Amino acid sequence: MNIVPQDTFKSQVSTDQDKSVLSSAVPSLPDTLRQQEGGAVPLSTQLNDRHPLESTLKNWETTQRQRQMEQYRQIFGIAEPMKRTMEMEIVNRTDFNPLSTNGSIHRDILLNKECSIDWEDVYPGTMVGDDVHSKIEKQLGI
Amino acid sequence: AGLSFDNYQRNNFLAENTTIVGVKFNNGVVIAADTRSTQGPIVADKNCAKLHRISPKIWCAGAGTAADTEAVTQLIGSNIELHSLYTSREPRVVSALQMLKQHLFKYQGHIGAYLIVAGVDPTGSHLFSIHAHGSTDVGYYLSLGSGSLAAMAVLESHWKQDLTKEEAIKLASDAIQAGIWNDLGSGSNVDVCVMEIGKDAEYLRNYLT
Amino acid sequence: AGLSFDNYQRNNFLAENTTIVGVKFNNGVVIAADTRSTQGPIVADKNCAKLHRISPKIWCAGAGTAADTEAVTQLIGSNIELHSLYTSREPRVVSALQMLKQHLFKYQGHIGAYLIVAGVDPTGSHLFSIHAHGSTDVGYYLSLGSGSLAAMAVLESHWKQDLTKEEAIKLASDAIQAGIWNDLGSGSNVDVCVMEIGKDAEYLRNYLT
Amino acid sequence: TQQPIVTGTSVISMKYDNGVIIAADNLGSYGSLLRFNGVERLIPVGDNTVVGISGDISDMQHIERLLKDLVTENAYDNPLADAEEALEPSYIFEYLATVMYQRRSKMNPLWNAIIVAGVQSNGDQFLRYVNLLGVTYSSPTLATGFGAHMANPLLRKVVDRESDIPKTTVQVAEEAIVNAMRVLYYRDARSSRNFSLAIIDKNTGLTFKKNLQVENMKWDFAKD
Amino acid sequence: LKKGEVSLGTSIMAVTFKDGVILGADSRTTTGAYIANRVTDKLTRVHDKIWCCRSGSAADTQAIADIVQYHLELYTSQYGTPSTETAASVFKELCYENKDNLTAGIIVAGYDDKNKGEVYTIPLGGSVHKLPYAIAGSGSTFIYGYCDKNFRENMSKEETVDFIKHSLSQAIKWDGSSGGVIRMVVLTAAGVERLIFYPDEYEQL
Amino acid sequence: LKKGEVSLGTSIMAVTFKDGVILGADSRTTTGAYIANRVTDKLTRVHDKIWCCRSGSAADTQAIADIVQYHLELYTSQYGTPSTETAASVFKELCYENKDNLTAGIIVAGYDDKNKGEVYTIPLGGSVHKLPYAIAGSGSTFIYGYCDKNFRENMSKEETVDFIKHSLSQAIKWDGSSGGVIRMVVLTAAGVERLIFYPDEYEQL
Amino acid sequence: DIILGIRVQDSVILASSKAVTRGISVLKDSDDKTRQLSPHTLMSFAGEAGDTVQFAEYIQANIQLYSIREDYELSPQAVSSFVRQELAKSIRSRRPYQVNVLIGGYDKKKNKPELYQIDYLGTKVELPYGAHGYSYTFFLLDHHYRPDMTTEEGLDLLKLCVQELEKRMPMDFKGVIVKIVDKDGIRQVDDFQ
Amino acid sequence: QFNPYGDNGGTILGIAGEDFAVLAGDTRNITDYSINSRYEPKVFDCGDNIVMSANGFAADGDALVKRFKNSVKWYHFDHNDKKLSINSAARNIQHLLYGKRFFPYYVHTIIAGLDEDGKGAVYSFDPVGSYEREQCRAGGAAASLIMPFLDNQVNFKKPLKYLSVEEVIKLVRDSFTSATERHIQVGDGLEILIVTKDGVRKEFYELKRD
Amino acid sequence: PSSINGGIVVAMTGKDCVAIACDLRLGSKFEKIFHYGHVFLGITGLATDVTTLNEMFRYKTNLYKLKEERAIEPETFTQLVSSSLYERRFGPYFVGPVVAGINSKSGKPFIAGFDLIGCIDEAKDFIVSGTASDQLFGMCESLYEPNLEPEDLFETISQALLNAADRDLSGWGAVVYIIKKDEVVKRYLKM
Amino acid sequence: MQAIADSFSVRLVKELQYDNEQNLESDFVTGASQFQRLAPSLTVPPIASPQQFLRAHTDDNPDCKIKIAHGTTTLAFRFQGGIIVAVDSRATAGNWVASQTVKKVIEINPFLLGTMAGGAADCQFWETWLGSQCRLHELREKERISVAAASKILSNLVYQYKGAGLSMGTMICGYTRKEGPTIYYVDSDGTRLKGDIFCVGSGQTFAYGVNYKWDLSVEDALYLGKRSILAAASVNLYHVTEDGWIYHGN
């Protein structure tokens, strides 16, 4: 029954937290070349000096959806949130368009956003590793 | 996606080193504003249109951060147009109010837009005030801006329940004129928009001068 | 003349770079204290006399800045002795209270002395509490110090109007003992002073050991 | 959390030969305003445990919800949920202390001081304390807030060591608790004259007394 | 709590009587010393016979009330008319779970066939308390004594109306953030009745 | 105002009635939440039929009261019994001229053959106001309405005693800084009468 | 750390102080503030601690990857543009760090030398001469610089600038390592500044 | 901002003998100038003949001891009930302490036991895991008083190597009695755990309660 | 060479004798112990304040001897030091003083210590001043015994100073005074 | 699908925060996986300013302060016979008795040595971790790791946590067949500096009087290191050759 997103801060850090860009020479350390972030961005700098509204904006829709699911569980039972989550998982799982970033029509229908526009829709948005094969590897988990 | 937070730390490091009225009358609503646009003490424009159109019969006028006001008005107008196409019905002022309120509450007051929204729909005539943090209020006559106190004084002087269209137009014009004369933020002209039930909206640019 | 303010700026520049009770009984008053003297967590002295004599039948015990307490008590004692010689009369507790109150108010709380003053004079028996800023209060039983809450609990448990000398002595000793046991600031011994109307003052050093 | 708004003052408790006694007043304050009268701060869990809570009232109600859910989850599919699989005071305290320390470590604490009192299934007395920092300790007498500074000295004169526990009857302990509550009402500005008390005995079970009032008040020497 | 945010300096009362419950409030909304709205309606309807009044942040309380009304519509689609206790529980959960980010206090007045009129108060922090009558707002502090001297159980409708009118008139008299007209809603088995009283009437009490 | 200074969180009332004036107060002195003295006498006598109650800093008010008593003795040595207005003027001058360094508020109740009982209030700042009755202290805020609904001019002595007792009982009930016994002084042409009421009496009102 | 650079008619001369970290006494004979991006493009950098070295090594790795992939060498202009983009990117989500880079190269398609300077905010300026770290050598450069100066005259001007710098610094300033980029590649002047 | 740390000042002392070890501590638990309890033990038997104490903020020390004991349980489960040596326990505790490098436990930790050769061993830890083996170490409020007493009594004066268990117990008791006489935070009681080849034995003595 | 702030002073009482000792920086003149006939004063803390206090007390003791026609006793000197320290209530000297001596008429040994505003701590066993070593107080507590002979008292105080010096090195020295009713012995320790 | 049902089927576990796998692992509920991480997991306070929190709570009564390594003089230099490392061995005094000699030089492996400066715990922990990484690398590649690779691993590790609060300065010294003898200096600021002579600590200027030539014998180099440490001021000496480090003691 949350309105503003909560529990947004990280509680533990490690040098191998980002499993997708781990170095092959030293698997305990990240691969800075394939990160393509400028080469001078330690993870610790991401723990401080953040805009206070960024976490609220990034997790707003998920928080509203979780509150809706909790209300359904309280009023309708377990089956209703179970079915909503199952439908959303099925739709999101079988969509794989490496050349596009726009969401599916069916996802918008499920989210009741058929005729709704937010700034995420208006503003939806290298040398190394920005190709189809990286997306294939991330999708398949290989 | 969405509004970006990039260069926030960089900008912090670099830093370390108007009269608007709305009046209800017996068969509709009227919104009015001044036309002076300033950049500090300098008058940037002597003829600026401050009345904006959410939908053909729903209009609004804002204060605060000008870019935020324009962007929020346009986004809500797009949502209203899409919703009207989806439902095949005339848009309602209550729907625009709900969208504006929830959008402003989502950003926790960081979008500095303060609005007066007037409109006519199949349910009738409506007038609302909207605050940046997401609170909304209803009223028969409203004022906004740096000249809102003088305009509100005029409105409190000459407002009554049985107002015709002409009386309402004159009252709104007088309130804007008082804000023009007694406030350094206003002064050039008066723009009016009249929304009457069952008729098209009437937009009067430079009604007085 | 008076207390000096020299080296105040120099000291600023360098910086930039106990249980006490008083109980009334039907024919007099009793004051009691503990004997532990500490400098931080270290016990400096296990047998320290905290009961001071303003006049032969007017005694007091203090807390706060120890040097301030001693200096103020001695100054008021000198004034009381001179006044008694001038008037050729036994000093009154009210006079000492007035002198202490006005002296402490003159310094606007910068003299950190908090006192319990008990005494017997030709007008009767008196017990007072004195705050650093100059406020004073009257009471039948009073407590002071870091162990004042436990002592006050004991006093509230076993106090009544018709108290004999022995009952009052036992009650004060029990209050000091509670402060001794339950407070880290107290603990060693109990010093008592009994002032009875028409008799000499009785100073019992280490009444409880 | 991060600030208390509506609060209760203090809870006191002691051990006697055959059980434990706990007590707390019925006031919820709103700063200097004595706003809510009729707040129950002793929560009976099972037939053998009583939990006293001081501090934030909303967090206290959250803890009450947690205790009720704990009882319900213990019951569940257990056939002998009340005969041999009933909750013990030690289990309840262990859960509560774990919660308190975990929420302290999250910088999202519950602003309360909690005393758990009861009798174990083998007849042993249980009396332990936890607070918002997760600090826990046990003693033959326990108190929170102002009571810790005034009730404990009075209660330790009756039960000063472990060997004093077998020598203390229920009547003496109850009288000591009542006198301590009277002293607190005398000297605590956020206290109330109405209080509740709970006796947990290995023979007579749980006795919960409500609507108890401080009596025999010496308001007579103020005339002069 | 937020900088430059609209606050609710109101006077709120809710009294249980023999036939049901009555909820009353003033009609003043101010920004500092300026009166932004002198005819605001503070009686919020979340269900046909479940109403509330709000204190604290206006935006936060409006969002919470909208979510509660949506929740009660969902509940009604399943099990029919909800009880006042259920609405109070939903309000309490929303206020308590978001107390670190939202400032909200709610007085809830309800009627149902089972409980026959109830009042709940949820002050800042999120705790809930059930009371025979409740007062809230900046102007309530001035009528704590008077109400305590003039409330009786099982009063008639007219006596309850008079008690609320007198108490709110005093609250308006002494509180600068309170003023305007007095608005009341009467919830009984017969239905919902709205009442309004004007300054020239209650200022002569 | 000064750091670590004793404040006066009291409940003070002064009521003018047909035969004279009555001044009433509670008897609680607190340091934060701890009650430093539960039987303190707050009725300060500056002349035989001129009494006062103090609020704000205890030391500042005590010093001001002592200076006022000395001033009134000097005045009496010359012209006889002073009027309540003269004492109020001296209090006002002392409070106003030192308002940048001292925090003091005074309620003055007096009787004399010419004016027949008067009440003056000097709040923080040093302004003076003459009133038929006055309330002050942290607990006064809770009885603003009740007093406004229950004061009448030219009441008898018993009615005034009852009014003060009820008002102070409510103030004690709702204010944490107020408690203990209720002490009153009655000033008439007959003389000075002291009264005390205990908690077991006024808590059952 | 101080860096200087002069673009003369047919080459680019880059001078970097062979300084050490503070609080630790070090003996070494290497230029640690210069990375060879390509056989005809050199980069000198100055600023704070290892952030700058991390950035320089990241840039070098990217440019070497491009050279291997295309079997071709990027022009100095493209290299400078890529460096500017990466520097702007690196501070889009963190507090900016002090860094200043001079990129000197010889374009063989145009057959001419080029010199660029990028500051800590990502501002790229094409200059005939530049410097960073100096608290005035600018007037000395202005009075004694011509576009058609040979390598020897540029070296003489650099020596004058070095002497002017050293006249107001302690003996802890060991010296400056000088490198030259021209049509034959990158070489080190082992003789003197 | 909410302050998550506290202080429950106590005193502990670990001494390594020739073929035994002792870890002692005062049983007083206090807050500011108040007494929370007069018998709250701070020295615990963790199994496998290892005694542990974490003096300072009591909640952090309790959490650390709980985590170590659970880890020992899993170590016995996963390694055929192998006995955990004292050096391995010290390494585990170092890792547990350093796991909170940016949100540290506010404790000072002492462990004691027998090494592989049967000699007594004591290990001392800094709040973030830096540890060393020592013959003797005192920690807490009265360490600066306890250490000179032992230094005057013993030579590290009969040598420590030839002292018996009873003599070490007497020395610890005398030092704690002196500290109780001099320090306000020390008193009530003293508890000593002795580790030998036969196991762990507990002894308790009373101290001044004022 | 010019850094002399700080230091320690230890005073102890034996049988019909007292001992007062202070640390000293030696190697390659500034002593913190002074005497005024038969009363010894050791001052720790800021060096300028130490010099100022020594000069002021020499002034006052000389005037006292000229007026009273007799040398000042330890108790009277203690009271004088207390009052002089309290005179600077709001600008106090950054010093910790210790007084030792033997009363001539009675023969009783006397030691005392002061805070920076003159509060008197009269101790029957020993006084430690300075913040150079926290374990110095513990070592003195462990080594002190009541009613020691002058040789035993000297050995005890010297051992305490030596152990304190070893706890915290080159150039350190000590000055020790053993005071009897009629004989005063001053010794230097280079260890 | 039934997993979704379990996620939506029910409070107590949520309050215990044990619904998260990391919390269960940290408290050893499901096993000892916490003691099986090649990259250690470091706890941070879940607030907006962890760095300010740590800095405020570390720079303030009991013995619970973070231990700081000795500021004593340490010297490292390289010659044709290998590397000489010399540390002034003068242990500080406290309320404890040392069981044996205290080592200010960390033995990373039988071929690598590191020097402690700043935070003792940081140096010890991260150099032991570096030894584990080097052992794994040597097992994988079937060859001894070069000094440059190990120093770079440590530098990258400390750079990932730059500004969090770590304080350390170390000298990695090693003799390999390919590189010869090599000395790097790595600190918590991310700097990684190859060198010939390093003097760190108080008195580094006096010890930097190193009479130095690449033809010194082993005995001459040991004597020179001892004399330099004495001039800075017992001395602990280490001689690192291709076959490993040898401890002399003096």
Collapse the DSSP code of B137 into the 3-class scheme (helix H, G, I; strand E, B; otherwise coil) and give the result. Answer: strand
- Bridge partners (DSSP) of residue I127 are I11
Return the biggest CA–CA distance within chain D. 68
Query: Residue B25: CB partners within 8 Å, gap ≥ 6?
Result: B163, B164, B165, B167, B168
Q: Give every CB contact of residue B156 below 8 A, 6+ residues apart in sequence.
A: none
Domain presence at residue C13: no
Q: Specify the DSSP element, H or E, that contains F31.
A: strand F29-31
Catalytic residue among J72, J74, J170, J182: J72
Measured CA to CA, the distance from residue G106 to residue J126 in angstroms comes to: 44
Which pair of tokens denotes residue B176?
A: 């804007």
Task: Report how far residue E129's alpha carbon sits from residue E120's, in angstroms, rounded to the nearest whole number.
Answer: 6
Q: How far is CA D83 from CA D20, D46, D68, D75, D124, in A?
A: 22, 11, 18, 11, 18
Torsion of CA G145, G147, G149, G155, to 10 degrees: 50
Domain coverage including residue J179: 72-250
* Angle of CA points F48, F51, F52, to nearest 5°: 160
In the block, tokens 């009541």 appear at: I146
Residues of chain D contacting residue H207, judged by C-beta atoms under 8 Å apart: none
Instruction: Return the half-sphere exposure (C-beta side, CA atoms, 13 A cut-off) of residue D196.
Output: 19
How is residue F91 written in tokens? 């209090």
The reply to whether residue G28 touches residue J198, judged by beta carbons under 8 angstroms, is no
Number of domains comprising chain I: 1
Residue C186: what residue type? S
**Number of neighbouring beta carbons within 10 Å of residue C193:** 24
Q: Which residues of E touch D (CB under 8 A)?
A: 96, 99-100, 123-129, 141, 144
In 3D, which of F43, F48, F47 has the Cα closest to residue F22?
A: F43
Distance, in Å, from the CA atom of B149 to the CA atom of B152, rounded to the nearest integer, reads 5
Contacts of H129 in chain J (CB under 8 A): 121, 124-125
C1 lies in some domain:
no
Helix (H, G, I), strand (E, B) or coil at C31: strand
Q: How many domains does chain H have?
A: 1
CB-CB neighbours of G164 under 10 Å: 14
Give the single-character DSSP code of D188.
B
Count structural domains, chain J: 1
Tokens of A69: 């699911």
Strand order in the sheet with G129-132: G129-132, G3-8, G11-17, G176-182, G185-188
User: Distances from the Cα of E123 to the Cαs of D20, D37, E133, in angstroms?
Assistant: 35, 14, 14
Discontinuities in chain E (C→N > 2.5 Å), after residue: none
Domains of chain F by range and CATH? 7-205 (3.60.20.10)
Q: How far apart are CA C6 and CA B195, in angstroms?
A: 79
Provide the domain limits for residue I92: 1-191
- C110·I123 Cβ contact <8 A: no
Q: Under a CB-based contact definition with an 8 Å cutoff, are residues C155 and C141 in contact? A: yes
J72 noted as active-site residue: yes
What is the three-state SS of chain I? CCCCCECCEEEEECCCCEEEEEEEECCCCCCCEEECCCEEEEEEECHHHHHHHHHHHHHHHHHHHHHHCCCCCHHHHHHHHHHHHHHCCCCCCCEEEEEEEECCCCCCEEEEEECCCCCEEECCCEEEECCCCCHHHHHHHHHCCCCCCHHHHHHHHHHHHHHHHHHCCCCEEEEEEEECCCCEEEEEECC
Residue G18 β-bridge partners: none
H or E element at residue F68? helix F58-79
Chain H: closest CA distance from residue D154 (Å): 14
From the CB coordinates, do chains I and E have 3 or more pairs under 8 Å? no
Closest CA to F178 of F43, F6, F12: F12
Q: Which residues of A touch G58 (CB under 8 A)?
A: 32-33, 38-40
Is B5 part of any domain? no
Which of I87, I98, I119, I137 best tests the C interface by mutation, with the highest count of C CBs <10 A? Answer: I119
- Cα F63 from Cα F51, distance rounded (Å): 15
Note whether residue C4 is domain-resident.
no
Look at residues F55, F13, F38 and name the one whose alpha carbon lies nearest to residue F167.
Answer: F13
Tell me the Cα Rg of chain I: 16
Identify all chain D residues contacting H37, using CB atoms and an 8 Å cutoff: 137-139
User: What is the distance between the alpha carbons of residues B138 and F37, in angstroms, rounded to a whole number?
Assistant: 54
d(CA D119, CA H175): 39
Q: Rg of chain A over CA atoms, in angstroms?
A: 19
Structure tokens at F203: 């808590």
Q: Which residue of H has its CA nearest to D3?
A: H2
CB atoms within 10 A of CB A10: 12
Contact G94 B6 (CB under 8 A): no
The count of residues in chain D is 224
Q: Which of D1, D141, D144, D169 is catalytic?
A: D1
Give the neighbours of chain D: at least 3 Cβ pairs within 8 Å: C, E, F, H, J
Max CA distance (Å), chain I: 47
Residue with tokens 């010419």: F114
The burial class, CB within 10 Å (0-12 / 13-18 / 19+), for H150 is: buried
Question: Which residues lie closer than 8 Å to F78 by C-beta, 6 or more apart?
Answer: none
* F86 backbone φψ class: left, alpha, beta (φ>0; ψ -120 to 50): alpha
Of D69, D98, D106, Cβ closest to residue J46: D106
Q: What is the largest CA-CA distance in chain H?
A: 54
CATH of the domain at I139: 3.60.20.10
CATH number, residue C74: 3.60.20.10
- φ and ψ of A64, to 5 deg: -65, -40
Domains in chain C, number: 1
Report the C-alpha gap between H67 and J29 in whole angstroms. 10
**In this structure, what token pair is assigned to residue J10?**
């029910």
Q: Assess whether chains C and J touch, using the rule of 3 or more C-beta pairs within 8 angstroms.
A: no
What is the rounded CA–CA span in Å between residue J37 and residue J27? 14
Asked if D6 lies within 8 A of E128 by C-beta distance, the reply is no
Q: Is B165 helix (H, G, I), strand (E, B) or coil?
A: helix
D138–H40 C-beta distance less than 8 A: yes
SS (H, E, C) chain G: CCEEEEEECCEEEEEEECCCCCCCEEECCCCCCEEEEECCEEEEEEECCCHHHHHHHHHHHHHHHHHHHHCCCCCHHHHHHHHHHHHHHHCCCCCCCCEEEEEEEEECCCCEEEEEEECCCCCEEECCEEEECCCCHHHHHHHCCCCCCCHHHHHHHHHHHHHHHHCCCCCCCCCEEEEEEECCEEEECCCCC
Q: Do G7 and G42 touch, CB atoms closer than 8 A? A: no
DSSP, res B61: E
E203 has a chain F CB within 8 A of its CB:
no
CATH number of the domain within which J232 lies: 3.60.20.10
**Rounded distance between C-alpha atoms, residue H138 and residue H156, angstroms:** 15
Distance separating alpha carbons of residues J197 and J221, to the nearest angstrom: 13
Range of the structural domain that residue C188 is part of: 18-209
Q: Which helix (H) or strand (E) holds A66?
A: helix A60-75
* Residue where the block lists tokens 């023009």: B180
Q: Could you tell me the CA-to-CA distances from D196 to C63, D141, D209, J198 in Å, in that order?
A: 38, 18, 6, 74
Cβ count within 10 A of residue D50: 28
Residue A19 DSSP code: G
**CA-CA distance, E49 to E23, in Å (whole number)?**
11
CA triple B187-B191-B195, angle to 5 deg: 150
E189 contact partners, CB below 8 Å, separation of at least 6: E19, E20, E111, E113, E116
- Map residue F139 onto helix, strand or coil: coil
> Searching chain C, which residue's CA lies closest to the CA of residue F42?
C137
d(CA I178, CA I187): 8
Q: Enumerate helices (H) and strands (E) in chain B, giving the number of each.
A: 5, 12
Q: Using CB atoms within 10 A of its CB, is residue B61 exposed (0-12), middle (13-18) or buried (19+)?
A: buried
Neighbouring chains of I at 3+ CB pairs within 8 Å? Answer: C, H, J
Angle at B61 between CA B60 and CA B65, to 5 degrees: 125
Q: In this structure, which long-range contacts are made by residues J144-150, counting pairs with CB atoms below 8 Å and at least 24 apart in sequence?
A: J144/J111, J144/J176, J146/J174, J146/J176, J146/J178, J146/J179, J146/J182, J147/J112, J147/J172, J147/J173, J147/J174, J147/J176, J147/J179, J147/J182, J147/J183, J147/J184, J148/J179, J148/J182, J148/J184, J148/J194, J150/J108, J150/J112, J150/J174
- Give the C-alpha distances (Å, rounded to integers) separating B174 from B34, B152, D107, G122, J55: 11, 11, 57, 54, 61
Handedness of CA J154, J157, J161, J162 (dihedral sign): positive
Nearest to J124 by CA among J163, J176, J167, J174: J167
Q: Which two tokens stand for residue J169?
A: 């300065």
Token pair listed for F150: 């229950």
Q: Which residues contact I115 (CB under 8 A, 6 or more apart)?
A: C66, C67, I85, I96, I121
| φ, ψ (nearest 5 deg) of residue E28 | -120, 130
Q: What residues of chain G lie within 8 A of the CB of B10, using their CB?
A: 91-92, 95-96, 121
Domain membership of residue C11 (yes or no) is no
Contact state of I167 with J95 under an 8 Å Cβ cutoff: no
Q: For tokens 């450069």, what's the residue? A: G141
Whether A69 contacts A82, CB under 8 Å? no
CB H42 within 8 A of CB H55: yes
Specify the amino acid at residue B148.
Answer: S
* CB of D6 closer than 8 Å to CB of D30: yes
Kindly tell me whether chain G and chain I come into contact, counting contact as 3+ Cβ pairs under 8 Å: no
CA dist G149 and A27 (Å) reads: 52
Strand partners, G16: G3, G177
Experimental method: cryo-EM
Domain hosting H158: range is: 1-210
What whole-number distance in Å separates Cα of residue H97 and Cα of residue H68? Answer: 10
Q: Under a CB-based contact definition with an 8 Å cutoff, are residues G33 and G46 in contact? A: yes
Phi, psi of A67 (to 5 degrees): -65, -40
Per the domain annotation, does B12 fall within a domain? Answer: no
- Using DSSP, state whether D20 is helix, strand or coil: strand
Instruction: Provide the total of helices (H) and of strands (E) in chain C, helices listed first.
Output: 5, 12
Distances B63 to C159, D23, D184, E11, G128 between C-alpha atoms, Å: 70, 59, 57, 30, 50
Chain H: partners with 3+ C-beta pairs within 8 Å: C, D, I, J
φ/ψ of H128, rounded to 5, equals -115, 20
Q: What is the DSSP string of F146-170?
A: HHHHH--TT--HHHHHHHHHHHHHH
Q: How many whole angstroms from its chain centre is CA J224? A: 26
* Continuous H helices in chain D: 57-75, 89-105, 146-156, 170-187
Catalytic residue among B18, B19, B69, B73: B18
Residue C11, classed as helix, strand or coil, is helix
Domains and CATH numbers, chain D: 1-224 (3.60.20.10)
Q: Does B153 touch chain E (CB under 8 A)?
A: no
What is the DSSP annotation of H172-188?
Answer: HHHHHHHHHHHBTT--S
Report yes or no: D101 at the J interface, CB cutoff 8 Å. no
The CATH number assigned to the domain holding H145 equals 3.60.20.10
Q: Is J120 annotated as a binding residue?
A: yes
**Phi-psi region at H155: left, alpha or beta (left = phi > 0; alpha = psi -120 to 50):** beta
**In the 3-class helix/strand/coil scheme, how is chain J assigned residue by residue?**
CHHHHHHCCCCHHHHHCCCCHHHHHHCCCCCCHHHHCCCCCEECCCCCCHHHHHHHHHCCCCCCCCCECCCCCEEEEEECCEEEEEEECCCCCCCEEECCCCCCEEEEECCEEEECCEEHHHHHHHHHHHHHHHHHHHHHHCCCCCHHHHHHHHHHHHHHCCCCCCCEEEEEEEEECCCEEEEEEEECCCCEEEECEEEECCCHHHHCCCCCCCCCCHHHHHHHHHHHHHHHCCEEEEEEECCEEEECCC
J48 located within any domain: no
